[PDB]
């Protein structure tokens, strides 16, 4: 009646902390933790690591063996739609009950047919936070979008018009690598590719102590690189396409040149002489992208904000002031209905070396 | 002797806390706190309240009376008449957090007491004490006021802070708090002509410090300083009809009748503009400890380019304001480092310092 809940919250927390270990590698699959308990002891633990790799339940089940019979399997996300039954468990505690299918949304009850005690809703908020992007793609058709911005004190960027993105500091660079690494994809404009010739990869060495936990060097997963170039200005000789992993171009007309194996291309309709960002997002949704980290110059960020597609703002502020000639999405207007678009609230603020990071979500 | 270090730390902390109670009403005098201890018991406490009123040590000594005879006084600033009071009330030991900065020739205060057979030290929490009087200490050391430049911003850098600010109540309350502790508030005539502000502290807009020092009848209106080199401000603008003084930084004498509480400061031009450096120097001679700047982009920028800004206080609103209302600075061309950052209602406030 009472101590059961006290213990329930203990083991679910444990199952949630395991699910997290998969957040770098799991895409397009969600994160899932599973903890099997018999007589106050964990007989089996597991989390989903990679799309083709075994489910969390499978991992924990293999571990528990015949010791599973007893009772209580703590899961992060409703199973099925199986082995949990064939390994005769009693009680199962689910945190969440399966997003989109909705037609198949109580495979939770399939275990009840086997006489298995079930229940859901434990720390559902935390399990929600754990799969923000995946869960968004399922409910809506849209990937979850984090917009990174490098600004000075007076708003403003890079001192020059060039759509080149300001990195503000090495610490801010190190901080972005970690956020990059849990994104399904990274998005940028062809202008940024032309102005910076960047790799837009994750570099394992730039990660910290999450180095120790999962993500050993060999497991490193490169987020999918997405480039917007309607006018096909990016060359097959640009660094970005030479990096390991796929790189997808969002272009208007198919490119005639010879591009590396890893290079793909999505054709996107226009909207007032410009590539339609809303269509593209949705298109990326169909293509199973959970979450996008955007390395935007002035134009891209503005267009995303005005299209109401951004879920989160991450603003890195350098302790500098910039002159008139400084570009800045800031002082320099361009946009009209930002005041009348999904507004954001502050969520976290932190020092990041000489910079500060302002974390904003639409909320 | 480690427990004595522990006791000293406690009593100095307390003296610092006491000193802080005068931060709203002490200008041009520093904030000073004193705690007298007589074998383990606090027998006298005191802090400075106002330039007209007595020094912290005198308050504390008055409370201790005969109890001061025994031993230790904790002062947050070396004492300087007022040094006879300490010697006359035969203390053993005074512990000062820092020595006087006015200048390095004044540092004699402690040596005066040591001749009387008092065991003296200095340096204990000389850092907190330093933070206690930034403006005053800077003036004494460099005849310049400590300048704090406030800025109000949307996420897209657009000037978004005029009392109906697109920022927030909480942020408006915060500014009042910070205004309340500046010796002076400085603005441009451009802001005066545009907004017609009072530039005062409204006591009701304060919180729990309502109860501290600072009952409503002790309200000290910070000195209003306005830059109009072209004498465009009028004697009928709200700012001059407020309690307290307003000082006009002028290039040339105005000819109109102004209330008795108004002054002008004649400031030379430097290449076509009023020389801000000389103004700050002159505000220094005028004993201005500290200046809270509430302006617009032009002035915010001239101060920044002159090298006169000691700290930035940047309020950012979680609003997105593209074309609405302009940018924060002009900068036709110091640098900064972040200190405290904090939430203020739905806004964030980022503090920065020169170095």
Contacting residues of B for A324, CB less than 8 Å apart: 330-332
Collapsed DSSP state (helix, strand, coil) of residue A14: helix
CA of B115 to nearest chain A CA: how many angstroms apart?
48
Instruction: Please give the Cα distance from A201 to A221 (Å, whole number).
Output: 9
Angle at B119 between CA B115 and CA B120, to 5 degrees: 90
A94: closest CA among A121, A59, A57?
Answer: A121
Name the experiment that determined this structure.
X-ray
A148: closest CA among A316, A299, A329?
Answer: A316
Interface touch B156/A356, C-beta < 8 Å? no
Alpha-carbon distances of B265 from B229, B231, B233, rounded to whole Å: 10, 12, 14
Collapsed DSSP state (helix, strand, coil) of residue A132: helix
Interface touch B328/A154, C-beta < 8 Å? yes
Instruction: Please give the Cα distance from B62 to A318 (Å, whole number).
Output: 52
Task: Take residue A132 and report the two structure tokens written for it.
Answer: 């923000």
A49: closest CA among A21, A83, A82, A70?
Answer: A21
Interface touch A315/B155, C-beta < 8 Å? yes
B248: closest CA among B202, B301, B240, B294?
Answer: B240
Contacting residues of A for B343, CB less than 8 Å apart: 346, 349
The set of catalytic residues of A is 57
Alpha-carbon distances of A284 from A145, A224, A226, A248, B324, rounded to whole Å: 11, 11, 10, 10, 33
Collapsed DSSP state (helix, strand, coil) of residue A26: coil
Angle at B274 between CA B269 and CA B278, to 5 degrees: 85
Instruction: Please give the Cα distance from B66 to A275 (Å, whole number).
Output: 86
Candidates A302, A336, A356; nearest CB to B341:
A356
Residue in B150, B156, B319 to test binding to A, most A beta-carbons within 10 Å: B156
- The half-sphere exposure of B27 on its side-chain side, counting CA atoms within 13 A, is 28
Q: How far is CA A285 from the centre of its chain?
A: 13
Instruction: Please give the Cα distance from B72 to B70 (Å, whole number).
Output: 8
- Which secondary-structure segment (H or E) carries A150? strand A144-151
CB pairs under 8 A between A and B: 110
Contacting residues of A for B338, CB less than 8 Å apart: 319, 351, 354-356
Give the 3-state DSSP-derived string for B184-245, with helices as H, strands as E and coil as C: EEEEEHHHHHHHCCCCCCCHHHCCHHHCCCCCHHHCCCCEEEEECCCCCCCCCCHHHCCCCC
Alpha-carbon distances of A124 from A13, A81, A136, rounded to whole Å: 11, 20, 15
Name the DSSP letter for residue B5: H
- Which secondary-structure segment (H or E) carries A215? none
Domains parsed from chain B with CATH numbers: 1-133 (3.40.140.10), 134-355 (3.40.430.10)
Interface touch B338/A355, C-beta < 8 Å? yes
Answer yes or no: is A111 a known binding residue: no
| Backbone dihedral region for residue A111 (phi beyond 0: left; psi -120 to 50: alpha; all else: beta) | alpha
Candidates A302, A343, A354; nearest CB to B319:
A343
Task: Take residue A226 and report the two structure tokens written for it.
Answer: 């997405």
Candidates B151, B321, B336; nearest CB to A319:
B336
The set of catalytic residues of B is 57
Task: Sheet with B94-96: list strands edge to edge.
Answer: B41-47, B33-38, B73-75, B94-96, B120-122
Task: Take residue B219 and report the two structure tokens written for it.
Answer: 């309200």
Instruction: Please give the Cα distance from A346 to A360 (Å, whole number).
Output: 5
CA of A314 to nearest chain B CA: how many angstroms apart?
11
Instruction: Please give the Cα distance from B249 to B247 (Å, whole number).
Output: 6
| Last residue before each break in chain B (C–N > 2.5 Å) | 80, 161, 333
Long-range contacts made by residues B138-141, C-beta under 8 angstroms, separation at least 24?
B138/B310, B139/B284, B139/B287, B139/B288, B139/B289, B140/B100, B140/B101, B140/B102, B140/B103, B141/B101, B141/B103
The residues on B that touch A, with CB distances below 8 Å, are 151, 153, 155-158, 304, 312, 314, 316, 318-324, 326-333, 335-338, 341-343, 346-348, 350, 352
- CB contact burial B139-178 (16+ within 10 A = b; e otherwise): bbeeebbbbbbbbbbbbbbbbbbeeebbbbeebbbbbbeb
Please enumerate in sequence order all residues whose Cβ is within 8 A of that of A182, keeping only pairs 6 or more positions apart, or say none. Answer: A23, A24, A291
**By the 8 A CB rule, do A134 and A267 touch?**
no
Interface touch A331/B331, C-beta < 8 Å? no
Q: Do β-strands A185-189 and A118-120 pair in parallel, antiparallel, or remain unpaired? A: unpaired
């Amino acid at each position: 009646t009472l101590y059961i809940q006290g213990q329930d919250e203990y083991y679910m927390a444990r199952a949630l902390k395991l699910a997290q270990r998969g957040r770098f590698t799991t895409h397009p699959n969600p994160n899932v933790g599973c903890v099997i308990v018999k007589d106050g002891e964990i007989v089996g633990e597991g989390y989903h690591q990679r799309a083709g790799e075994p489910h969390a339940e499978v991992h924990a089940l293999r571990m528990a063996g015949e010791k599973a019979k007893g009772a209580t399997a703590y899961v992060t996300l409703e199973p099925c739609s199986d082995a949990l039954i064939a390994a005769g468990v009693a009680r199962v505690v689910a945190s969440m009950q399966d997003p989109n299918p909705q037609v198949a949304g109580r495979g939770l009850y399939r275990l009840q047919q086997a006489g298995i005690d079930v229940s859901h809703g434990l720390m559902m908020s935390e399990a929600e936070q754990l799969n923000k992007g995946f869960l968004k793609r399922m409910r809506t058709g849209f990937p979850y979008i984090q917009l990174k911005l490098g600004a000075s004190l007076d708003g403003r960027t890079a001192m020059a018009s060039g759509e080149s993105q300001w990195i503000t500091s090495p610490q801010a660079r190190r901080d972005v690598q970690l956020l990059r690494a849990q994104s399904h994809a990274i998005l940028t404009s062809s202008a940024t590719v032309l102005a910076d010739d960047p790799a837009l990869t994750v570099r394992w060495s730039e990660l910290d102590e999450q180095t120790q936990a999962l993500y050993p060097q060999q497991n490193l997963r490169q987020p999918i690189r997405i480039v917007i170039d309607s006018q096909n200005r990016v060359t097959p000789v640009h660094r970005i396409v030479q990096q390991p992993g796929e790189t997808w171009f969002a272009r208007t007309q198919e490119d005639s040149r010879e591009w590396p194996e890893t290079v793909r291309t999505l054709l996107i309709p226009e909207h007032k002489g410009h590539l339609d960002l809303v269509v593209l997002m949705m298109q990326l949704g169909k293509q199973q992208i959970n979450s996008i980290w955007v390395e935007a110059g002035p134009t891209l960020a503005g267009a995303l904000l005005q299209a109401g597609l951004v879920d989160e703002l991450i603003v890195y502020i350098a302790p500098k002031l910039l002159g008139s000639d400084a570009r800045g999405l800031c002082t320099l207007p361009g946009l009209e209905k930002l005041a009348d678009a999904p507004q954001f609230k502050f969520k976290e603020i932190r020092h990041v070396g000489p910079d500060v990071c302002l974390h904003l979500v639409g909320a």
